[PDB]
Amino acid sequence: VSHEQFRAALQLVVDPGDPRSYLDNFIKIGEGSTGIVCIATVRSSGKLVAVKKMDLRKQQRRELLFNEVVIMRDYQHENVVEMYNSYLVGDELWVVMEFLEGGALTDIVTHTRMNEEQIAAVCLAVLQALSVLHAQGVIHRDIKSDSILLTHDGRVKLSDFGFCAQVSKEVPRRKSLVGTPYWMAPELISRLPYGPEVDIWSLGIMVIEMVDGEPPYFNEPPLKAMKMIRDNLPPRLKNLHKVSPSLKGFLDRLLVRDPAQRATAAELLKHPFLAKAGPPASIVPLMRQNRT
């Protein structure tokens, strides 16, 4: 209620036409938040682009599809996947965007071990994106290894803005239950109003992902993991013995239950731990095509 009505809304917002008129060879390479992602070949050049396809009928909250368009229009950044154009094809929204051929951090985190130079590099890049986005009222809301993307030469970009929302003077806090269970901030699961701090919490879980290979309570059912995140002290690393004190001190500024006491992305940009961050080249060996 109502599908055709909602197609009309997106039509006014999107670029006219159908990108199949310039793209060949759609190959599905995945599926995240809200739809599937394909590679396509630009017919004129042989260049590769990505196309996020999102079926209108398959969305829990169709209105959030507009967040895609809102970020395309207002928030360009080096560590944010650039989106180029959007179209309404049948009952799907297509967003032609930058192709991150290095894939998602999740493939790295599950298959190899990251050293701290590489963990810091990823953290630095994400925090660069975040502090700019946060400075402008934007909260990503689904930070985790799947939402972090890589170029072939190891550069790091935030993707997957389907769950994002804005804050400001008039609406300083959000109330929606959005994200992926295991990465969700305790205040967000608590249904208390929240702000950009939830993104910093989710980064903490991602640091855990980076050291342990998984987020905490990953074994548990989603709802049980959420309760445990809500009700207990911050979750610990399985491999605490393996981290430098520098890292532990950093991670302790992220996984703070009191959102007011939690570090902001701007504060964190100055934390000593990031001194260890290496060039995007340091991430390169981790990728599937390079590791053996």
Where do the domains of the chain lie? 1-99, 100-292
- CB-CB contact of 201 with 255 (8 Å): yes
As beta bridge partners, residue 85 has 96
- CB-CB contact of 105 with 122 (8 Å): yes
**Assigned token pair, 125:** 């890049």
- CB-CB contact of 97 with 187 (8 Å): no
What is d(CA 8, CA 56) in angstroms, rounded to the nearest whole number?
A: 12
**Assigned token pair, 262:** 């939690």
* Position 222, amino acid: P
- CB-CB contact of 147 with 140 (8 Å): yes
Resolution for the entry shown, Å: 2.3
- Give the ranges where the chain is alpha helix by DSSP (H): 3-13, 65-74, 105-111, 116-135, 186-189, 197-212, 222-231, 245-254, 265-268, 280-283
**Assigned token pair, 92:** 């799907």
- CB-CB contact of 161 with 140 (8 Å): yes
- Residue numbers preceding breaks in the chain (C to N > 2.5 A): none
Known active-site residue 142? yes
- CB-CB contact of 116 with 276 (8 Å): yes
Q: Is 37 helix (H, G, I), strand (E, B) or coil?
A: strand
Q: Is 180 annotated as a binding residue?
A: no
Q: Is 48 helix (H, G, I), strand (E, B) or coil?
A: strand
Q: Is 284 helix (H, G, I), strand (E, B) or coil?
A: helix
Q: Is 274 annotated as a binding residue?
A: no
Q: What technique was this entry resolved by?
A: X-ray
CATH topology of domain 1-99: Phosphorylase Kinase; domain 1 (3.30.200)
**Assigned token pair, 110:** 């599950």
**Peptide bond before residue 2 is cis, with ω within 30 degrees of 0:** yes
- Number of Cβ within a 10 Å radius of residue 290: 12
What is d(CA 58, CA 35) in angstroms, rounded to the nearest whole number?
A: 8
Q: Is 139 annotated as a binding residue?
A: no
Q: Is 35 annotated as a binding residue?
A: yes
100-292 is a CATH 1.10.510.10 domain = yes
Domain 1-99 and domain 100-292, same fold? Reply is no
Q: C-alpha distances in angstroms, 61 versus 3, 33, 138, 203, 250?
A: 12, 12, 18, 25, 35
Which one from 142, 146, 199, 212 is the annotated catalytic residue? 142
Using alpha carbons only, give the angle 93, 63, 30 rounded to the nearest 5 degrees: 45
Q: Is 17 annotated as a binding residue?
A: no
